[PDB]
Design a protein around this ligand. Structure first.
Ligand SMILES: NS(=O)(=O)c1cccc(NC(=O)NCCCCO)c1
Ligand SMILES: NS(=O)(=O)c1cccc(NC(=O)NCCCCO)c1
Ligand SMILES: [Zn+2]
Length: 257
């Protein structure tokens, strides 16, 4: 199957997912001197008060926390978005070294990791329908920088021992994703895609200006996860990021000056 190694990684994906070479692929480099401030962009509305987390799981390419999206509990609205998008899951991408790991870059700078909070457009009824639409998903991307610890991440970090290998999952109820946000909601936005197969061109990307700070010990625990399943040769889950893709006929807009 696909992965992030030399024999199944991003340079190979197009052979099974030809949209990998499409017109609105993600991630991209955000050139801060080419992004345009758009004073028409509304502030984001992050309404996570009623979020209901369910499980945390190792799916062989990241770890993911899932949420009950059977009704408008945790939603993302405003910003560039029309209508209401429900939080479905979040997951991360990270590096083997602190100078790499993020998918988006800022002026070619790579961050140690990147958080993706994945939301789907309720007008399409279910997520499978949404992924077929150019405005079906909104992913809120947040950079992780190595510095002080992020207290709202520690509960995630402390359970990763229990989902070391692909296919493992654990209960992860009563987790508050608001603890993963930075102070500012200033953002860049552009139309793009999923950054993993199937690479569907269905995502409004909203990337926050302000990174969150996580400690070295927190990101070390990401790097102890495994791509493999139990009983298989161990392969550390590191460098699960796609590099920046051609911007092509797109403009990145900024909500701030
Ligand atoms: N899904 S994909 O990235 O297009 C892809 C393309 C080519 C091979 C793979 N999987 C592979 O196993 N490639 C190398 C073979 C190692 C066999 O044990 C996935
Ligand atoms: N990395 S991302 O653009 O935020 C994103 C968001 C939502 C879905 C995906 N891609 C996938 O879930 N691919 C399915 C992989 C099958 C095993 O879990 C990527
Ligand atoms: Zn992602």
């Amino acid at each position: 199957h696909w992965g992030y190694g030399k024999h199944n990684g991003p340079e190979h994906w197009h052979k099974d997912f030809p949209i990998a070479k499409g017109e609105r692929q993600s991630p991209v480099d955000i050139d801060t001197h080419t992004a345009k401030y758009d004073p028409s962009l509304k502030p984001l509305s992050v309404s996570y008060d009623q979020a209901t987390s369910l499980r945390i799981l190792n799916n062989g390419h990241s770890f993911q926390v899932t949420f009950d999206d059977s009704q408008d509990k945790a939603v993302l609205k405003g910003g560039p978005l029309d209508g209401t998008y429900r939080l479905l899951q979040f997951h991360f991408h990270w590096g083997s070294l602190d100078g790499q790991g993020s998918e988006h870059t800022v002026d070619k700078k790579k961050y140690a990791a990147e958080l993706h909070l994945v939301h789907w457009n309720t007008k399409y009824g279910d997520v499978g329908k949404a992924v077929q639409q150019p405005d079906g998903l909104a992913v809120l991307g947040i950079f992780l920088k190595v510095g002080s610890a992020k207290p709202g991440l520690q509960k995630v970090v402390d359970v990763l021992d229990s989902i070391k290998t692909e296919g493992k999952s654990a209960d992860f109820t009563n987790f508050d994703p608001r603890g993963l946000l930075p102070e500012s909601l200033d953002y860049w936005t552009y139309p793009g895609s999923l950054t993993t197969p199937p690479l569907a061109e269905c995502v409004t990307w909203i990337v926050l200006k302000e990174p969150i700070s996580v400690s070295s010990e927190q990101v070390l625990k990401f790097r102890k996860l495994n791509f493999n399943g139990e009983g298989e040769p161990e392969e550390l889950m590191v460098d699960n990021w796609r590099p920046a893709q051609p911007l092509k006929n797109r403009q990145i807009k900024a909500s701030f000056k």
